[PDB]
Design an enzyme around this catalytic site. Structure first.
Site, mmCIF file in Angstrom:
data_model
loop_
_atom_site.group_PDB
_atom_site.id
_atom_site.type_symbol
_atom_site.label_atom_id
_atom_site.label_comp_id
_atom_site.label_asym_id
_atom_site.label_seq_id
_atom_site.Cartn_x
_atom_site.Cartn_y
_atom_site.Cartn_z
ATOM 1 N N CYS A 1 -3.103 -19.279 2.993
ATOM 2 C CA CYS A 1 -1.960 -19.967 1.975
ATOM 3 C C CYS A 1 -0.715 -19.253 1.719
ATOM 4 C CB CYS A 1 -2.572 -20.202 0.899
ATOM 5 S SG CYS A 1 -1.821 -20.976 -0.306
ATOM 6 N N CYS B 1 -10.028 -27.850 6.403
ATOM 7 C CA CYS B 1 -9.519 -27.121 7.385
ATOM 8 C C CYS B 1 -10.420 -26.430 8.444
ATOM 9 C CB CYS B 1 -8.358 -26.342 7.189
ATOM 10 S SG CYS B 1 -6.821 -27.291 6.711
HETATM 11 N N1 LIG Z 1 1.758 -20.085 -8.381
HETATM 12 C C1 LIG Z 1 2.196 -21.172 -7.566
HETATM 13 O O1 LIG Z 1 2.569 -22.350 -7.850
HETATM 14 C C2 LIG Z 1 2.080 -21.039 -6.015
HETATM 15 C C3 LIG Z 1 2.408 -22.159 -5.463
HETATM 16 C C4 LIG Z 1 2.508 -22.032 -4.065
HETATM 17 C C5 LIG Z 1 2.092 -20.855 -3.438
HETATM 18 N N2 LIG Z 1 1.636 -19.857 -4.096
HETATM 19 C C6 LIG Z 1 0.848 -18.915 -3.135
HETATM 20 O O2 LIG Z 1 -0.516 -19.176 -3.154
HETATM 21 C C7 LIG Z 1 -1.364 -18.071 -3.038
HETATM 22 C C8 LIG Z 1 -2.352 -18.120 -3.914
HETATM 23 O O3 LIG Z 1 -1.893 -18.232 -5.165
HETATM 24 P P1 LIG Z 1 -3.127 -18.035 -6.365
HETATM 25 O O4 LIG Z 1 -2.278 -18.227 -7.795
HETATM 26 O O5 LIG Z 1 -4.201 -18.701 -6.229
HETATM 27 O O6 LIG Z 1 -3.280 -16.454 -6.377
HETATM 28 P P2 LIG Z 1 -3.617 -15.230 -7.481
HETATM 29 O O7 LIG Z 1 -4.064 -16.013 -8.422
HETATM 30 O O8 LIG Z 1 -2.268 -14.520 -7.555
HETATM 31 O O9 LIG Z 1 -4.791 -14.403 -6.715
HETATM 32 C C9 LIG Z 1 -4.457 -13.397 -5.969
HETATM 33 C C10 LIG Z 1 -5.728 -12.835 -5.308
HETATM 34 O O10 LIG Z 1 -5.563 -12.045 -4.173
HETATM 35 C C11 LIG Z 1 -6.110 -10.642 -4.500
HETATM 36 N N3 LIG Z 1 -5.610 -9.529 -4.151
HETATM 37 C C12 LIG Z 1 -4.275 -9.078 -4.401
HETATM 38 N N4 LIG Z 1 -4.229 -8.031 -4.004
HETATM 39 C C13 LIG Z 1 -5.324 -7.510 -3.209
HETATM 40 C C14 LIG Z 1 -5.586 -6.322 -2.394
HETATM 41 N N5 LIG Z 1 -4.881 -5.318 -2.156
HETATM 42 N N6 LIG Z 1 -6.914 -6.423 -1.822
HETATM 43 C C15 LIG Z 1 -7.747 -7.395 -2.283
HETATM 44 N N7 LIG Z 1 -7.584 -8.448 -2.749
HETATM 45 C C16 LIG Z 1 -6.078 -8.621 -3.365
HETATM 46 C C17 LIG Z 1 -6.376 -10.738 -5.988
HETATM 47 O O11 LIG Z 1 -7.673 -9.903 -6.590
HETATM 48 P P3 LIG Z 1 -7.644 -9.374 -8.105
HETATM 49 O O12 LIG Z 1 -8.761 -10.526 -8.572
HETATM 50 O O13 LIG Z 1 -8.426 -8.261 -7.638
HETATM 51 O O14 LIG Z 1 -6.296 -9.154 -8.702
HETATM 52 C C18 LIG Z 1 -6.810 -12.247 -6.353
HETATM 53 O O15 LIG Z 1 -7.832 -12.579 -5.939
HETATM 54 C C19 LIG Z 1 -0.380 -16.966 -3.191
HETATM 55 O O16 LIG Z 1 0.288 -16.264 -2.106
HETATM 56 C C20 LIG Z 1 0.784 -17.766 -3.754
HETATM 57 O O17 LIG Z 1 2.281 -16.670 -3.769
HETATM 58 C C21 LIG Z 1 1.717 -20.222 -5.475
#
Ligand SMILES: NC(=O)c1ccc[n+]([C@@H]2O[C@H](COP(=O)([O-])OP(=O)(O)OC[C@H]3O[C@@H](n4cnc5c(N)ncnc54)[C@H](OP(=O)(O)O)[C@@H]3O)[C@@H](O)[C@H]2O)c1
Ligand SMILES: O=C(O)c1ccccc1-c1c2cc(I)c(=O)c(I)c-2oc2c(I)c(O)c(I)cc12
Length: 205
Positions: free
Chosen positions: A108, A187
């Site tokens: 993603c 997928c």
């Molecule tokens: N917000 C939106 O509306 C939106 C829209 C489109 C795309 N996106 C993108 O979609 C993707 C998924 O977003 P989300 O909101 O589901 O993600 P999120 O809630 O920000 O979760 C991020 C995940 O990545 C893990 N992570 C971060 N750094 C890490 C590291 N160094 N080692 C291991 N794990 C790590 C976090 O672990 P911890 O639990 O340990 O913190 C958490 O499990 C992101 O890339 C985001 O930018 C977001």
């Protein structure tokens, strides 16, 4: 068919539901987590938990070993600062996949990588720049890579009824986290999106 998967980012907003759905669907799931307290007790549970960091090659290697496919749902938990976590993590993931013979990754980034690139909100530009770096790493890996580029991630129910386009136009500019996870899993059972960028969206009202 794919049976064993690793999920990176399983404790995040989309990751948690993807993980639950994957286990309920019958996958044997391994997760890499920095903090296991962020995994739930209730509901479906992963088969294997590796405690570590996606920036540590050895931790990634342990997570990818033996898998059939990888799902990447890494993110910054709304930290909008300049960052290389996702792209450096992806580099480690690709290296581990190649070391272990794993050839399928579904990852993603965001719909900003499909939409006019001059229309990214300024506050999201730094994260978007790292999504672009991560997409490059995955596209150039040669592995079978499905690029999932969602719009705003919402809280609406799971439907399984969303639309997937290849160009960033669609019925809406939202996808529920549950539907996004459902699509990630879809997928795993088709080749039709390999090498493509995909845009899931749905009208929930
Ligand atoms: N917000 C939106 O509306 C939106 C829209 C489109 C795309 N996106 C993108 O979609 C993707 C998924 O977003 P989300 O909101 O589901 O993600 P999120 O809630 O920000 O979760 C991020 C995940 O990545 C893990 N992570 C971060 N750094 C890490 C590291 N160094 N080692 C291991 N794990 C790590 C976090 O672990 P911890 O639990 O340990 O913190 C958490 O499990 C992101 O890339 C985001 O930018 C977001
Ligand atoms: O997720 C939210 O609600 C939110 C809450 C607080 C601060 C930012 C966001 C947010 C995003 C955060 C990250 I990190 C990211 O990576 C991406 I892409 C985001 O895309 C967003 C998009 I698209 C939106 O339409 C809207 I409204 C908000 C966001």
């Amino acid at each position: 068919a794919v049976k064993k998967i690793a999920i990176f980012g399983a404790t995040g907003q989309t990751g948690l539901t993807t993980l639950a759905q994957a286990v309920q669907a019958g996958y044997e799931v391994t997760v890499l987590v920095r903090d296991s307290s962020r995994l739930p007790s209730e509901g479906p549970r992963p088969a294997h938990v590796v405690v570590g960091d996606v920036l540590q090659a050895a931790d990634v290697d342990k997570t990818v070993a033996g898998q059939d496919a990888v799902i990447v749902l890494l993110g910054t938990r709304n930290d909008l600062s300049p960052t290389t976590v996702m792209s450096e993590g992806a580099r480690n993931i690709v290296a581990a996949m190649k070391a272990h013979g794993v050839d399928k990754v579904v990852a993603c980034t965001s719909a900003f990588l499909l939409w006019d690139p001059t229309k990214v909100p300024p506050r999201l530009q730094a994260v978007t720049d790292d999504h672009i770096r991560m997409h490059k790493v995955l596209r150039e890996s040669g592995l079978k890579y499905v690029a999932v580029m969602p719009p705003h991630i919402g809280d609406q129910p799971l439907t399984g009824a969303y639309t997937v386009t290849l160009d960033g136009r669609g019925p809406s500019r939202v996808i529920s986290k549950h539907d996004l996870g459902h699509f990630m899993l879809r997928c795993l059972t088709t080749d039709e999106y390999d090498g493509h960028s995909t845009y899931p969206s749905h009208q929930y009202q």
